[PDB]
Amino acid sequence: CTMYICGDSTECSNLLLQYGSFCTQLNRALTGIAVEQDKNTQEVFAQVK
Amino acid sequence: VNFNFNGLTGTGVLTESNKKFLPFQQFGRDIADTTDAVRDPQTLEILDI
Amino acid sequence: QVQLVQSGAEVKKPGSSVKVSCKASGGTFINYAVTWVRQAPGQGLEWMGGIIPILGIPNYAQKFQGRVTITADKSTSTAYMELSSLRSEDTAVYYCARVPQAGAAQGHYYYYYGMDVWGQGTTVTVSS
Amino acid sequence: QCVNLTTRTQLPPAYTNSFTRGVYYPDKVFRSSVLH
Amino acid sequence: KIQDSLSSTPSALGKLQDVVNQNAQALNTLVKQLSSNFGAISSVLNDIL
Numbered sequence: 001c002t003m004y005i006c007g008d009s010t011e012c013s014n015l016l017l018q019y020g021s022f023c024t025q026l027n028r029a030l031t032g033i034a035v036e037q038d039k040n041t042q043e044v045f046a047q048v049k
Numbered sequence: 050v051n052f053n054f055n056g057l058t059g060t061g062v063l064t065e066s067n068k069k070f071l072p073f074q075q076f077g078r079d080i081a082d083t084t085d086a087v088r089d090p091q092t093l094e095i096l097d098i
Numbered sequence: 099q100v101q102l103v104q105s106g107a108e109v110k111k112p113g114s115s116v117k118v119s120c121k122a123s124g125g126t127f128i129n130y131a132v133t134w135v136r137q138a139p140g141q142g143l144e145w146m147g148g149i150i151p152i153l154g155i156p157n158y159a160q161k162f163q164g165r166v167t168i169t170a171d172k173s174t175s176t177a178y179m180e181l182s183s184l185r186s187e188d189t190a191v192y193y194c195a196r197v198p199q200a201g202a203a204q205g206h207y208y209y210y211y212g213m214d215v216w217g218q219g220t221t222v223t224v225s226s
Numbered sequence: 227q228c229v230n231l232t233t234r235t236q237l238p239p240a241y242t243n244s245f246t247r248g249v250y251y252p253d254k255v256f257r258s259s260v261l262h
Numbered sequence: 263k264i265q266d267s268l269s270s271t272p273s274a275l276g277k278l279q280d281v282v283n284q285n286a287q288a289l290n291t292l293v294k295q296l297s298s299n300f301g302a303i304s305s306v307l308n309d310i311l
């Protein structure tokens with residue numbers, strides 16, 4: 001989020017800090033999707049030990 | 050009622066407490082950063098909100 | 099009784115890097131401001147950078163940014179300056195110098211005196 | 227009415243480890259059973 | 263042997279104790295968004311007013 005919005009600019013990153021925690025939620029949602037994508041395959045193919 | 054404790058504004062009900070402050074701390078805060086207790090400037094006693 | 103001595107002359111080829119050392123004996127050396135000055139043949143003088151050993155953060159000129167590095171060693175009491183990515187225009191004489199009264203305030207430096215004790219000079223000739 | 231004192235300045239000081247020292251209360255807020 | 267398997271392993275009920283953590287945490291981020299300037303000079307309405 002930070003690098004997408006304000007590319008390596010300190011004065012942009014200091015202004016971005018006043019909006020709270022908007023970027024962390026996006027990172028968390030994307031991480032959750034990425035984690036679910038592996039259970040999707042594991043529940044289908046791994047049926048024999 | 051409405052209270053103005055040395056710069057802290059708000060509405061609510063006050064009552065006695067059992068908390069103990071170190072002798073430089075003025076007020077207290079909760080998990081979500083909401084004020085919970087205050088100290089009377091003139092009597093140095095702890096009150097709830 | 100404060101005196102600073104440098105290393106010997108150097109001959110280099112383009113694209114290499116050089117490192118010059120300055121050893122000061124007879125003083126505290128901890129609260130001074132050690133600078134670096136360059137003089138080209140038949141030209142004037144230029145400012146490169148400086149450091150206060152006790153603090154540990156140097157100040158660099160804008161022109162020599164990303165190309166020079168100044169460090170200090172308190173135990174052996176010796177200051178190092180390293181110059182990389184050599185060109186053919188980096189052929190001059192280098193001087194150590196010392197500012198006795200220097201402060202910090204914020205991350206910058208503040209001087210209240212001029213340089214009084216100088217080094218001797220190290221010639222660095224870059225060619226091929 | 228000053229008097230000169232220093233003479234023959236010599237060997238620089240020494241250095242020591244600090245471990246975990248130099249922590250102060252940042253503000254005047256009372257907290258209990260929490261990590262900040 | 264079902265009681266031993268449930269009691270000995272603490273993480274047996276990981277699916278049920280996973281919507282409680284997600285629901286509560288998403289609530290906290292809401293309340294903590296009441297202390298952001300959002301470009302203004304203060305986060306308190308009565309202070310600016």
Ligand SMILES: *[C@@H]1O[C@H](CO)[C@@H](O[C@@H]2O[C@H](CO)[C@@H](O)[C@H](O)[C@H]2NC(C)=O)[C@H](O)[C@H]1NC(C)=O
Pocket residue numbers: 090091092
């Ligand atoms: C602020 O002034 C008030 C008024 O004197 C103080 O309250 C009195 O303090 C004395 C101290 O021994 C008590 O005996 C009285 O009973 C108090 N109440 C009165 C006189 O009505 C108060 O202590 C002062 N605050 C501070 C922090 O010194």
